[PDB]
Amino acid sequence: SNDYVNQMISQMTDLAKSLNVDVTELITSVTQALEALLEEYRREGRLTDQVEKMASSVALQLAAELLAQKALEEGHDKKQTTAKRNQISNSYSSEAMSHARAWAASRHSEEEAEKLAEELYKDMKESLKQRIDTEQ
């Protein structure tokens, strides 16, 4: 929705401020990559509300890791930049996995749900990262 995209962009701008780097160039690449991933998941019948929320969390994790690299390239302090990156990335990967586990718990047996949630995160992050890099 409009609110889903705007919420993601708001959070991306927050993490950009934290890392002291301009969010501008990544907004286009991340929004386009996220849109394309969601359309693929929808077409294939893989999308649910928790999966959509998870995808925003993963996009934000990747934005933080990419923006932190640009902060290092711009000369920002390495210890502070990487500490902030790691805190932000940890927060978003934790959020993403919490959505993944909620998706899996109502749909799969207790035995396989953990592995499928882990696999969903891995596959989703790999796909988004490839899509973001293609746009960039």
Author numbering: 3 to 138
Authors' own words:
Here we introduce Chroma, a generative model for proteins and protein complexes that can directly sample novel protein structures and sequences, and that can be conditioned to steer the generative process towards desired properties and functions. We sought to characterize the space of possible proteins parameterized by Chroma by generating a large number of unconditional samples of proteins and protein complexes (100,000 single-chain proteins and 20,000 complexes across two versions of the models, v.0 and v.1). The experimental characterization of 310 proteins shows that sampling from Chroma results in proteins that are highly expressed, fold and have favourable biophysical properties.
Our experimental validation shows that Chroma has learnt a sufficiently accurate distribution such that sampling from it results in proteins that express, fold, have favourable biophysical properties and conform to intended structures at non-trivial rates.
